[PDB]
């Protein structure tokens, strides 16, 4: 049944909608479109910061991170009022989380280190975790771009939503690690319309939220029910038929959210 509004969230907003939220204890899993691939856009970030704490001591976090000007490519609200002084990773992260600051991202990609800019490191951080669909070939902001049906830069609501599941309510981190990226997740700036627009005040939700080209809108969450119940909520949409200058739509990401919650009250 469900499904049935999915689709016709679709049809309201010329969209192609993708749910996953994992199944628990006490709930089924909740699918639609949930093993398509969509872009990963900005929702990468999120296991991009993960990264960096993973292969990284805490005492890495301290590390300042210097720039130029011409590293600035993307929406990076952060980054550029820091080009003189340079950030730490630390800062990095928490621009590359509650910021989606772009170029923040560019560098922790660089800090891991390798080919393509530190793209396929990440990917392999993803398989590390079980994941073998996902994959980032593109930096910022080119992976914001690709075409339709292109498989780069790619992950699934299925793929995604599982990784973020073990990143914050598995034991992918230690728990001091795991700490700072819930946190950075709890206090993200960007999400405020989508996933947090469609549950109730008194649920709990961290997110991270992606935007692109093609009407891209991503945002995957942790919700907390009223009580404490933990789930995870992956969303993603595009509008490919609607061009390269599709305008994304972020109330389709409320409404499905709502739909979500329906069915997890």
């Given at each position: 049944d469900l499904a049935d509004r999915f689709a016709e969230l679709e049809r309201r907003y010329d969209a192609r909608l993708g749910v996953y939220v994992p199944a628990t204890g006490t709930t089924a899993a909740i699918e639609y479109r949930a093993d398509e691939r969509f872009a990963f856009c900005s929702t990468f970030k999120a296991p991009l910061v993960a990264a960096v704490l993973h292969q990284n001591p805490l005492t890495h976090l301290d590390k300042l991170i210097t720039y130029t000007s011409d590293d600035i490519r993307s929406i990076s609200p952060v980054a550029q009022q820091h080009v003189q002084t340079g950030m730490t990773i630390g800062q990095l992260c928490d621009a590359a989380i509650r910021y989606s600051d772009g170029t923040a991202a560019n560098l922790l990609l660089a800090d891991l280190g390798g080919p393509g800019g530190g793209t396929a490191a990440f990917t392999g951080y993803l398989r590390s975790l079980g994941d073998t669909?996902?994959?980032?070939?593109?930096?910022?902001?080119?992976?914001?771009?690709?075409?339709?049906?292109?498989?780069?830069?790619?992950?699934?609501?299925?793929?995604?939503?599982?990784?973020?599941?073990?990143?914050?309510?598995?034991?992918?981190?230690?728990?001091?690690?795991?700490?700072?990226?819930?946190?950075?997740?709890?206090?993200?700036?960007?999400?405020?319309?989508r996933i947090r627009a469609g549950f109730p005040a008194d649920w709990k939700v961290i997110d991270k939220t992606g935007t692109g080209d093609y009407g891209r809108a991503n945002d995957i969450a942790v919700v907390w029910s009223p009580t404490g119940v933990p789930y995870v909520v992956a969303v993603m949409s595009d509008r490919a038929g609607g061009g390269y200058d599709a305008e994304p739509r972020e109330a389709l990401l409320a409404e499905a959210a709502t739909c979500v919650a329906g069915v997890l009250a």
């Amino acid at each position: 049944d469900l499904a049935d509004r999915f689709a016709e969230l679709e049809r309201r907003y010329d969209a192609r909608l993708g749910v996953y939220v994992p199944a628990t204890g006490t709930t089924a899993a909740i699918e639609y479109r949930a093993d398509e691939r969509f872009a990963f856009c900005s929702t990468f970030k999120a296991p991009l910061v993960a990264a960096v704490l993973h292969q990284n001591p805490l005492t890495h976090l301290d590390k300042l991170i210097t720039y130029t000007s011409d590293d600035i490519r993307s929406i990076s609200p952060v980054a550029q009022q820091h080009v003189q002084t340079g950030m730490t990773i630390g800062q990095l992260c928490d621009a590359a989380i509650r910021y989606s600051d772009g170029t923040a991202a560019n560098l922790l990609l660089a800090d891991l280190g390798g080919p393509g800019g530190g793209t396929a490191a990440f990917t392999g951080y993803l398989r590390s975790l079980g994941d073998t669909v996902s994959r980032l070939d593109a930096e910022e902001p080119e992976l914001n771009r690709d075409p339709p049906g292109d498989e780069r830069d790619t992950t699934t609501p299925h793929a995604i939503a599982l990784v973020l599941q073990q990143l914050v309510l598995g034991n992918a981190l230690p728990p001091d690690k795991r700490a700072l990226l819930t946190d950075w997740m709890a206090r993200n700036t960007t999400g405020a319309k989508r996933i947090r627009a469609g549950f109730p005040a008194d649920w709990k939700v961290i997110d991270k939220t992606g935007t692109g080209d093609y009407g891209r809108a991503n945002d995957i969450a942790v919700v907390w029910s009223p009580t404490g119940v933990p789930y995870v909520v992956a969303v993603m949409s595009d509008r490919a038929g609607g061009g390269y200058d599709a305008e994304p739509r972020e109330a389709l990401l409320a409404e499905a959210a709502t739909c979500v919650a329906g069915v997890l009250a």
